[PDB]
Ligand binder design. Sequence first.
Ligand SMILES: OC[C@H]1O[C@@](CO)(O[C@H]2O[C@H](CO)[C@@H](O)[C@H](O)[C@H]2O)[C@@H](O)[C@@H]1O
Length: 404
Amino acid sequence: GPVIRVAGDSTAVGEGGRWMKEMVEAWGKKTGTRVEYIDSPADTNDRLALYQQYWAARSPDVDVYMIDVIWPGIVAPHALDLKPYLTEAELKEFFPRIVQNNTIRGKLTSLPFFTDAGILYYRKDLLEKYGYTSPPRTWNELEQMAERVMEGERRAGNRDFWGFVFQGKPYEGLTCDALEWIYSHGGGRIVEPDGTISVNNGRAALALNRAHGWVGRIAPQGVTSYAEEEARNVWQQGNSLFMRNWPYAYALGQAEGSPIRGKFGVTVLPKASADAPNAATLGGAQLMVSAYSRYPKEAVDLVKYLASYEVQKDNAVRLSRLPTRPALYTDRDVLARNPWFRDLLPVFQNAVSRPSDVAGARYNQVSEAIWTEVHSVLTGRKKGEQAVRDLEARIRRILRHHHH
Ligand SMILES: OC[C@H]1O[C@@](CO)(O[C@H]2O[C@H](CO)[C@@H](O)[C@H](O)[C@H]2O)[C@@H](O)[C@@H]1O
């Protein structure tokens, strides 16, 4: 009978790929359907290019794809419209904002799977060791705490120790980090939902100059090549006071044999001042049935299973990844394992989006301009002032004649 083939998530990032394959096999076993899992590269933008090869070829060789929240506008032609396969009540069990994100020109491209938001990880043991009672609320405080704790730990002999790690590599992760920096300095959303390219302003330039000031100082020099796992590895080995990362790092840091188990908390990222907005970049994944699948009915059943209450629960409990079902945030088991899901729920609800809605199918080109210009600041090649001006000009070129 049919073999249902899935590409989604990566065995190169935490437990996501291994867990995905497990869930797919569990569906196979439960329904008596053969399945295969195709692995993907770590970085989301590498995955887009890979999947685009299948799509260009109209390939039937993958039935279900896991897609990034930033992709619906790009991948819509390659998606089976799911709208006819779900009742309004079923669809209403997901966050409306994400169902809306996934709906392009009335086509429901994909089912919400997990959401995501950038957060601050911090070493509670080290904060207490150095006389601090709360994580930093401002970037200045983060800098001050990082400098003092680094000095003491280095003095105590940990030559691997840093104040702060984050994602500085030139790729989509850097777009995510940089939207947080810019937005939390009152610098806007880079490209506003209305289409205005707003990034050329003093607050955005300050934000980028501030991040350059971290490199080689409180953050390793090599942070300019760090993606999520590079940052997580330095953090998890116990060698960073602070990390900016996504929810998935929490379960991994708590696992048996993690050097930092029981020693950390999470909170909202800092901001430039009390009246700036909190910044948490919206992330997440959706489940798409391929328009080129020979088995749409079976693919849809798999997608419904993966997005179900109990699979999302398993993802929450075991991998500390955020449900797309509001009902899971009141589930006793989800909460007892991850109490911070409740504490940071409003942070997740107010997460700021990358400009994927307004850029649509040109989002990947916009994002590439953003991460390359940001990276030029992190490396000391350009000041933030020049970078935001050059970025404005690039984005204008890229989006000229695009209307939302
Ligand atoms: O594969 C799922 C896994 O990928 C991550 C990054 O490791 O996804 C987040 O980060 C991306 C940028 O690098 C964003 O584009 C994406 O939207 C966001 O979810 C993990 O957090 C997630 O578990």
